[PDB]
Amino acid sequence: GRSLELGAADIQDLESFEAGRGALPARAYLQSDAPRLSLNGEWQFRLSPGSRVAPDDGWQLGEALNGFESLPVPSSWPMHGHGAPAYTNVQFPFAVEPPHVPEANPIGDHLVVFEAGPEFFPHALLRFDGIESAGTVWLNGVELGTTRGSRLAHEFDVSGILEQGENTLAVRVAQFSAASYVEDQDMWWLPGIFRDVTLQARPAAGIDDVFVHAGYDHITGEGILKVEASRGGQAIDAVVRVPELALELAAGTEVRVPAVEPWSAEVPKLYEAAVSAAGESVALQIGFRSIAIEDAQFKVNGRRILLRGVNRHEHHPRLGRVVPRDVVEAELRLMKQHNINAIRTSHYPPHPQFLALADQLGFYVVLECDLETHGFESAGWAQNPSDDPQWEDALVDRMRRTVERDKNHASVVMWSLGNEAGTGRNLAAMSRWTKDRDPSRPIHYEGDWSSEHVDVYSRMYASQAETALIGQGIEPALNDAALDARRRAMPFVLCQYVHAMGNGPGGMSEYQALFEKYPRLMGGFVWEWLEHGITVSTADGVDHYGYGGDFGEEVHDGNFVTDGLVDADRRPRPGLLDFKKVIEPLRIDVARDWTGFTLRNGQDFADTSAFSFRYEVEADGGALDGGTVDVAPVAPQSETVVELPGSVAALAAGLSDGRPAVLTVRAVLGADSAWADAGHEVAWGQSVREPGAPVPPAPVEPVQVQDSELTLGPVVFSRATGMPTSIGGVPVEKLGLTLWWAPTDNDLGREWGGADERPLATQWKDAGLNRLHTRLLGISANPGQDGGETLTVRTRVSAADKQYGVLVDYTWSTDGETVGLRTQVRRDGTWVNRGFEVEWARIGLEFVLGEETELVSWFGQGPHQSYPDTGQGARAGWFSLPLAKMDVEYVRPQECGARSGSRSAALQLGGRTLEICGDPFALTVRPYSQDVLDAAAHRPDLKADGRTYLYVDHALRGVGTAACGPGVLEQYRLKPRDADFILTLKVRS
Amino acid sequence: GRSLELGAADIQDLESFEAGRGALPARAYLQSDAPRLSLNGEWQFRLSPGSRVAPDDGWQLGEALNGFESLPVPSSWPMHGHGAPAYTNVQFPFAVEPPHVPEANPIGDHLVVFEAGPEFFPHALLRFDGIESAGTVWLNGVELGTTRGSRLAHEFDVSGILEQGENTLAVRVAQFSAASYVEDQDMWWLPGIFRDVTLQARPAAGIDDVFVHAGYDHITGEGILKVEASRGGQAIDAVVRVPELALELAAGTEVRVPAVEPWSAEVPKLYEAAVSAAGESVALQIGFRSIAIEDAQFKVNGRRILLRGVNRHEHHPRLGRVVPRDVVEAELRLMKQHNINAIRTSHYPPHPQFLALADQLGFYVVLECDLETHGFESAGWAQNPSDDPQWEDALVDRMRRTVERDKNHASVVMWSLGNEAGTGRNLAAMSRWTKDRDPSRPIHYEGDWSSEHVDVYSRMYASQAETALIGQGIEPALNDAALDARRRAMPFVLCQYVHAMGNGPGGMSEYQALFEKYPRLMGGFVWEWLEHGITVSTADGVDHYGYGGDFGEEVHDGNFVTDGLVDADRRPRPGLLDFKKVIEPLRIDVARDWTGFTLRNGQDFADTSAFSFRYEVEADGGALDGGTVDVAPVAPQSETVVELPGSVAALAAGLSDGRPAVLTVRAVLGADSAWADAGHEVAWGQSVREPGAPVPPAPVEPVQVQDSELTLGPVVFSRATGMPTSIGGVPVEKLGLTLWWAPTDNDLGREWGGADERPLATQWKDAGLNRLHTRLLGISANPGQDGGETLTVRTRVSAADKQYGVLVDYTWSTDGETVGLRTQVRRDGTWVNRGFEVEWARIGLEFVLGEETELVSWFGQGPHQSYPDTGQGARAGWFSLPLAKMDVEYVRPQECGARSGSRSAALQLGGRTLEICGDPFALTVRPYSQDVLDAAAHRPDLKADGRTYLYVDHALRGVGTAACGPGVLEQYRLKPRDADFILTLKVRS
Ligand code: NA
Ligand code: NA
Ligand code: NA
Ligand code: NA
Ligand code: NA
Ligand code: NA
């Protein structure tokens, strides 16, 4: 019979296993003096729902365009109202049947008219730095070719096709193609021509490609320099000039520069250079550095380095995969400002302009090829393109374009084959190709744990325990003795760790101590730098971030795309403030007697001469003493004890007992740097003189009794419930025990440890911890002092359908001014439910007050939140914030905002002030309840109800990283137990 | 110190382990000529939230009532806006810490003024037939006592307290008490004075209690009669008269009536009798029957009986636990009309008036004590009141009041100790007490499988397989040899089986065949008779039923209270129509040659003389022949072959081949009965002459091709998709394969069989069956006949992120009038997901039509729905219903309304008619999509969208009873497989 379906030819091309056709050889991205014209700007665009209905109406000519409208290019076109973004993590959004594509496949036709002056003849090309996922390119109706590899560059010769004057460039882009099966990164699906489009003249006697080789001999101090230059794939005559080093040499010859200052992330020394032929000159920035593996350590310039890293996706909350240059520069500065020294380009090459900025600002870069096949894992990796010989040419092409583009940049210290792509013959082919092309950079790939085709051993989210075993070289052996010996000689990197989703990440300090202890450990890269929030404006014009499912997706992964150290607009999350402290490159340990501090220089290359060392003593009234102390430069990996002026110690000795005072020593930048202004804080340490325990008020005030109320000084109690209804005139609507919090993203994750396959959030719901009930057992007034009395209220807390509970006793006392509150908690019954021991989130009290709080002040840790396994960046001091600024604007609202280690607190309720003191407690204050917080999926769902929710916790659980990787470490868990704690309360005007 | 809490005395009483205080001895409910006054009517009512704030303001006197309002009594007070109903199944709504009660405990103060004439002096009492859960009673300010046992009667002597003329009765009712721990039935929590309140004069020389003993000697035909009569607990002189039997005897003497007609559910013969003393006469209805266990069979009057039973809760959708008498009478008639002969009073004694109606209409009754402690199971039965000696007196009191009230009623054939109360010493004490008081009725209790203290072996939801083993006496042995021998000599009853929640129950026929095969099997009681829906009126005034969670409950069990054979207003569900057929008491097997039918009388006592046997032959045009055939009475458990008139067989022989005709033989009531009018259908059987296969149209019409459309006779196809866009001018918006349906309540239940602990609904979601995607592979026109052509469209169906699929090929053909459609389905890949084989709900097609359907007609099974393991009550015939009447109004919308076994169908779309024919298919038609159906939680969420959703299924899965008990039996499951089926389509005006 006769074939009748439509669009079969277009679909066959989209199903191609091969790389793009018609492109020039892959090469470096080079700054050249050749004439160039950027075609970025306002293009014309038409969208069709699939190949079979994509018109074949000659639109490529620009004449009588039917159905086109203006669209910026570069762009991710769903960010501009054409379709919508869609988020999946691992799962494909289409049926898995490679190489076939779904019928619903957005086809975007792009068209731009431009003018080519005489400087673009006789030879020129068109460059495309990124098209997701399949491009077909026509110029003046003539097909140039196709693009595969969404984040890779393609160039097409236009000689004999480009015309003098007006030209018409047409590009048909398909969202889905066979290449989608190898681009399954955990991120938004966003088609478009999302990077630069450039016309570049190719003058005769020019330079097509350049390969910089700039090594460093750390013994002699020599630089080893060879700059290759080619045209049409052939080495050519060219002259290399490096003026700062008094150098003129031929391209292609290796020389020995007697002395060079070596490049590192800490000291990113770059030498300006130019390589030029008769027709073209290329400008280079040369950093001399050598990379080697020896004694199972990753070494640069002869030294083991510590990677303080993040995984960087490219995302912008309004432009999608288009990241404006100013945002790139700003976020790299922000990384440096938080002590980061390393970046993994998860999981594809970045915009080409990123490389020079990393060279300049100083980051160790893991440059990763555009390859991920994670969605094949759930079928046992059946049909995985990574092990399918039909995909070999396509995957080698991806690696070749990755390597060729960025090979000249000192910041790149490892090539990565891809991410979560299983094991297979094509990964081996990619590795062999890279090792042969560029032996100067070790190869990284986590997906094959046997590490057969790599030079470093990489894992993601390995526990602190397994990392310690690896650090000692005693992890279990591979079955193959030869492969085991190879891997045991490799250094070890965590390419992803301490998953930073929501409240968290907990457990960072335990990893860092191992990094410092064991040379084989290279460090780690946090997952991830940024949340992929997409800005949404609601009915009222109130902006907030959207995540998976908020754009009508049929299958999605929710807020797992919002898992970053900064939000999509680069505002730090608390996790980044903690991370900065965890990875600080200097350690400052202040002596308890305030005579001095131990200073350890944790850097690998630089001394301490860039830093100014400042001290300040702060007390309740303010600063009492402070200044700068001169420190002879301390070498990398060396230590010294720095004396503080005698006045500081003398001040500590004269302090009256119980008066709190904090000595803080900081290392700040002595001068402006390329990434921060002078005075920027890099490291700090403290010694605290703690306030004395608040003496409980003498119980000299008696209990006065009325039919329905009891009064004890400034406290009024309901006689029916035994609970206070007001304290100093502040209405108390509720007081009770808490054991639960609104689950974090981590609490919604499964702990793949133990026989319990429920997330902690589910364990808590099953146990009833979110719906506690209180029974009153009795109320008694007991003799106090000089006619005074204490009031003891006995209660039992439990939950419907449960037999376990806790006996909670409140003992109240007052001298008329201060109120004393002792709370005693005693376990009743066995706290087991559905066969497993119940764990608590906290041991604390919730005060619900009938008035709003405008201001929260405290002495403790701050300014930001802290939980048992977080809060490293929260330092001791006196803090005060408006109520709203106590919250944390996580995209999915969740437990957050607790200030652990508080010794005193003050809430301003309009005109009066409520003061809380006692042994250390955690402090949280909110204008809405925990049930409202738990129910809210986006921040607009949070609405104040005119009350104050005050949380005073005697104990808290950690937050961990159970959303992906380890849960809460054993020492931070909270099993049911007896407890007792004392508070004082005071209300003033 | 000094005690200061409030209300401690009230709470201490509520925590009492003891029975109520102050009541007269428990006795029978008796029809007496003693003067009586019902105090039912409009009372005054005040509600307090708990004991500690319940006023002690002297309200018991009726003077200056502060805060009282009118309330009907009897009532469940949350049904009248005081609080709200709350539904839990097993879980308690309060902390489990017996005997303690929560602080939130509705306290209802009831008050009524009444007048007592001289006939109520000097002696009278007040009777309360039910108070949930704790009552305290005052008369004229004087405390009478308290009530415990919510569904049990209490009487208080008011001699010397009742006054001539005006009196004031005050009752304080607490919702929760220690007794709540032993009243954990799966039902709504509903406090109130919910049964009659009566003043009764007690004249001197009267009769307090009566115990009827009326046995039957099945050998001699004698009745064995002894009527005991007592006053103040002492046997008294009284005369018993039974006029119909020519009897006058003294109370307390056993006599032998020479001949009596025995009582059974089938023939509920009752003799009017009176026992009288000088001061009082009591009217009785005496049914002579004897109960015995012999040869491991439960026998009445010397015959093993088959229980065709339901579990009857007391519920009314607007009045709660108050069931108006007219509703009781109507629903018992409805039970008889659906062949039911047995009732279990789950799980408490019914209203006292129920007993006489069961005597009269004829049901075997399992009368169950008010005891259930199910909520202790989840803590390993720790603290279970059933094994706590401190609860012995309270639990024996419950059993004593249960037995004493109803002991005179022939319909009661077993006493049940309670339900789901574990095992324990107090259950044994209850059994010992009952066996001693009334040896004439065997004891039932399912909670102790060892059956130590019972006379029958009872289970709930035992599988058909285990029931077959029990029926053969080869179930596994108990560890105790003595207890094993006892239990193996017991008959076996399913006190609850074939859970009737939502679409279902499936698997009824397999149980019934075992009941018929094995004498040891007594039968079973369906769970349950009625859905406990509560009527709710929404914003627009649209009524619907609410279930758990719809009334603000903190903990609840959702729609598990809507699990009945009839809805709360007693409208039959399809399950009741199927059940009636399953348990029909006669079997009618029509010969294939239409010469006669085999008639088996499945009754235990009655012959067939109450029935008229009618036949009718029906064809497309209408009835062709019919009449009545005289049948000599067939004895119980006997069989005969009844000849039909020769004209019927002659008609079958003359039928042209392929013409459909149905011979139906019915057994209807020959005369009015007490429960249905003459002509009521009891049993039926059929023989069908099936229509010949529709010959496919000759493919003489060719495919005409256009740029974007293909036309083949009356079918227009999209050339882009290959699917029809119209058939005979009827718009087709979508056509595709189906494998999924909107989960039933059963599909949301876990199959505790196999290693997969996901409900089927979850298995389907995980597998993507609800989100199928279709890829087009090709379209071809092939040579047909005489220039005609067929059109074959090749597709593959799968789901996002899955590698398995099905190849689906559509072959279209037409002669211009009729359209032929062949569908071929071929498995592609292994249909396994998350480690388990995927199961399908169906193999079918969904047509989405762009116009509404007003009427659906078909030849097949009807009128109601049928699935592979249901539809017994759906008979063969021609049916036609408005679209809305094809649906089933389940409270939670779910898959329903399929008509299996359809051979032809006709949809009326405005003016035109769409006809479907072919080999048997299942037919479903809806005005909304499956996704709308699945998302809808209540019926108002269903909204028509102006389309027609037509489902034609080649195969369906069964529905089972997985919500509670067995899932779908193996033979009704649907594993992925290849399939092929043919349809013809025709559109007319
Ligand atoms: Na991934
Ligand atoms: Na993520
Ligand atoms: Na939330
Ligand atoms: Na139960
Ligand atoms: Na139920
Ligand atoms: Na539904």
- 102-141 in B: which are within 8 Å (CB) of A? 102-103
Q: Does A505 touch chain B (CB under 8 A)?
A: no
Quote the ligand 5 centre to B328 CA distance (angstroms).
20
Q: Residue B40 burial by CB count (10 A; 0-12/13-18/19+): exposed, middle or buried?
A: middle
Total residues found in chain B within this entry: 989
> Can you read off the two tokens belonging to residue B779?
């379209």
Closest approach of B814 to chain A, Cα-based (Å):
17
CA-closest candidate to residue B590, choices B555, B614, B562, B619:
B614
> Which residue from A779, A799, A805 is facing B5, i.e. has the nearest CB?
A779
> Can you read off the two tokens belonging to residue A444?
């990284």
Q: Does A774 touch chain B (CB under 8 A)?
A: yes
Give the three-state DSSP class for A611. Answer: strand
CATH architecture assigned to B703-988: Distorted Sandwich (2.70)
Residue A109, strand partner residues? A46, A172
- How far is it between the farthest Cα atoms of chain B? 109
Number of CB atoms found within 10 A of residue A782's CB: 14
Q: What are phi and psi of A427, to 5 degrees?
A: -65, -40
> Which residue from B5, B95, B710 is facing A776, i.e. has the nearest CB?
B5
Q: Residue A26 burial by CB count (10 A; 0-12/13-18/19+): exposed, middle or buried?
A: buried
Contact A775 B6 (CB under 8 A): no
Residue B458, strand partner residues? B493
What residues of chain B lie within 8 A of the CB of A384, using their CB? Answer: none
> Can you read off the two tokens belonging to residue A249?
């040499």
Name the closest residue on chain A to residue B803, using Cα atoms. Answer: A96
Residue B544 Rama label (left phi>0; alpha psi -120 to 50; beta): beta
List gaps in chain B by the residue before each (C–N > 2.5 Å): none
Domain ranges of chain B: 8-201, 293-580, 703-988
Contact A803 B97 (CB under 8 A): yes
The resolution, in Å, is: 1.9
Residue A53, strand partner residues? none
Name the closest residue on chain A to residue B798, using Cα atoms. Answer: A95
Q: What is the 3-state secondary structure (H, E, C) of B854-919?
A: CEEEEEEEECCCECCCCCCCCEEEEEEEEHHHHCCCCCCCCCCCCEEEEEEEEEEECCEEEEEEEE
Q: How far apart are the first and last CA of chain B?
A: 93
Q: How far apart are the first and last CA of chain A?
A: 93
Calpha distance A513→A471 (Å, rounded): 11
Calpha distance B134→B172 (Å, rounded): 8
Helix, strand, coil abundance in chain A, percent, nearest 5: 15, 40, 45
CATH assignment of A293-580?
3.20.20.80
- 587-626 in B: which are within 8 Å (CB) of A? none
Q: Does A91 touch chain B (CB under 8 A)?
A: yes
CB-based contact A233:A261 (threshold 8 Å): no
Closest approach of A149 to chain B, Cα-based (Å):
21
Q: What is the 3-state secondary structure (H, E, C) of B607-631?
A: CCCCEEEEEEEEECCCEEEEEEECC
Cβ-Cβ contacts under 8 Å for B255 (sequence gap 6 or more):
B224, B225, B226, B247, B249
According to CATH, the superfamily of the domain at B8-201 is Galactose-binding domain-like (2.60.120.260)
Contact B800 A554 (CB under 8 A): yes
Q: Residue A349 burial by CB count (10 A; 0-12/13-18/19+): exposed, middle or buried?
A: buried
> Which residue from B95, B555, B803 is facing A97, i.e. has the nearest CB?
B803
> Which residue from B95, B789, B805 is facing A802, i.e. has the nearest CB?
B95
Calpha distance A121→A162 (Å, rounded): 8
In this structure, the strands spanning B412-416 and B364-368 are parallel
Name the closest residue on chain A to residue B101, using Cα atoms. Answer: A775
Quote the ligand 1 centre to A544 CA distance (angstroms).
26
User: Which strand (E) or helix (H) includes residue B431?
Assistant: helix B425-437
- 658-717 in A: which are within 8 Å (CB) of B? 703, 705, 710
Calpha distance A968→A754 (Å, rounded): 13
Name the closest residue on chain A to residue B53, using Cα atoms. Answer: A720
Q: Residue A653 burial by CB count (10 A; 0-12/13-18/19+): exposed, middle or buried?
A: exposed
Q: Which residue has the tokens 């005193």?
A: A904
> Can you read off the two tokens belonging to residue A955?
């104990």
Residue B487 Rama label (left phi>0; alpha psi -120 to 50; beta): alpha
Q: Calculate helix-pair angle for A508-517, A464-471, nearest 10 degrees.
A: 0
Alpha carbon of A332 to those of A29, A335, A570, A604, B286: distances in Å? Answer: 20, 5, 10, 21, 96
Q: Does B94 touch chain A (CB under 8 A)?
A: yes
CA-closest candidate to residue A153, choices A340, A13, A351:
A351
Q: Does A806 touch chain B (CB under 8 A)?
A: no
CA-closest candidate to residue A173, choices A111, A114, A97:
A111
Tell me which ligand sits closest to the C-alpha of residue A742. 3
Calpha distance A496→B733 (Å, rounded): 48
Q: Does A757 touch chain B (CB under 8 A)?
A: no
Residue from B100, B555, B803 whose CB has the most chain A CBs within 10 Å, to mutate: B803
Contact B805 A95 (CB under 8 A): yes
Tell me which ligand sits closest to the C-alpha of residue B558. 5
Calpha distance A163→A634 (Å, rounded): 64
Contact B780 A3 (CB under 8 A): yes
Contact B775 A97 (CB under 8 A): yes
> Which residue from A102, A781, A802 is facing B96, i.e. has the nearest CB?
A802
In this structure, the strands spanning B521-526 and B492-497 are parallel
What residues of chain A lie within 8 A of the CB of B5, using their CB? Answer: 719, 722, 776, 778-779
> Can you read off the two tokens belonging to residue A700?
């000299």
Number of CB atoms found within 10 A of residue B70's CB: 10
Q: Does A986 touch chain B (CB under 8 A)?
A: no
Calpha distance B329→B520 (Å, rounded): 32
- 7-36 in A: which are within 8 Å (CB) of B? 7
Number of CB atoms found within 10 A of residue B589's CB: 16
CB-based contact B185:B372 (threshold 8 Å): yes
Tell me which ligand sits closest to the C-alpha of residue B420. 4
Amino acid identity, position A448? D
Calpha distance B208→B202 (Å, rounded): 8
Cβ-Cβ contacts under 8 Å for A2 (sequence gap 6 or more):
B780, B781
Tell me which ligand sits closest to the C-alpha of residue A374. 1
DSSP A326-381: HHHHHHHHHHHHTT--EEE-TTS---THHHHHHHHHT-EEEEE-S-B-GGGGGGTT
What residues of chain B lie within 8 A of the CB of A798, using their CB? Answer: 95-97
Quote the ligand 6 centre to B685 CA distance (angstroms).
36
Quote the ligand 1 centre to A421 CA distance (angstroms).
8
Residue B520 Rama label (left phi>0; alpha psi -120 to 50; beta): alpha
Calpha distance A796→A810 (Å, rounded): 11
What residues of chain B lie within 8 A of the CB of A102, using their CB? Answer: 773, 775
Number of CB atoms found within 10 A of residue B356's CB: 16
Give the three-state DSSP class for A3. Answer: strand
> Can you read off the two tokens belonging to residue A78?
């769903």
Q: What is the DSSP letter of A436?
A: H
Contact B555 A775 (CB under 8 A): no
What residues of chain B lie within 8 A of the CB of A91, using their CB? Answer: 800-801
CB-based contact B12:B65 (threshold 8 Å): no
User: b or e along B224-235 (b: 16 or more beta carbons within 10 Å of the residue's beta carbon)?
Assistant: bbbbbbbbeeee
Residue A36, strand partner residues? A200
Closest approach of B783 to chain A, Cα-based (Å):
7
Calpha distance B179→A173 (Å, rounded): 73
Number of CB atoms found within 10 A of residue B486's CB: 17
Closest approach of B211 to chain A, Cα-based (Å):
42
CB-based contact A717:A710 (threshold 8 Å): yes
- 275-304 in A: which are within 8 Å (CB) of B? none
CA-closest candidate to residue B284, choices B367, B228, B206:
B228
Calpha distance A263→A256 (Å, rounded): 16
